[PDB]
Symmetry: C2
C-alpha cells in the first residue's frame, strides 16, 4: 500500500471504449492486484480484479469483440 497506482475501484466499464486493459499483480509494491483500463479517449479507469464484469471483459477481449 506504498506505491499503488489505484486509490479506488469503479464499475460500469464497457469493452467498446477500452483500448488497453492491464493487470498489475499484487506484490511489495501494492497489497492488492489492480486492473487499469486505458480507454480510447486516453483516460484511465481502475477496476477491481475480483469483479465478474471485468473478468468477462478480459475474456471477451482475448476471445470475441
Amino acid at each position: 500500500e506504498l506505491r499503488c497506482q489505484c486509490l479506488q475501484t469503479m464499475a460500469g466499464i464497457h469493452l467498446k471504449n477500452i483500448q488497453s486493459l492491464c493487470v498489475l499483480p499484487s506484490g511489495p509494491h501494492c497489497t492488492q492486484t489492480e486492473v487499469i483500463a486505458t480507454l480510447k479517449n486516453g483516460r484511465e479507469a481502475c477496476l477491481d480484479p475480483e469483479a465478474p464484469l471485468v473478468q468477462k471483459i478480459v475474456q471477451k477481449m482475448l476471445k470475441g469483440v
Copy 2:
C-alpha cells in the same frame, strides 16, 4: 495505430510475469495482442488465442 508485436513467444508462466496487458483488436491491429513484462523486466508478446494465456490472465485477476 499499428501492432506493437512483430512476433509471438511461448513458455511464459504466471509466476514469471510482473505485468500483463491486453490490447484488443481494432483498426490499429488485426489481432488482439498480449504484452507481458516479466519479473526480469524484458517484455514478451503472448498469443491471446492460446488457452494457456487466457487461463493465466484470469488467474492473475483471481490473485494467483
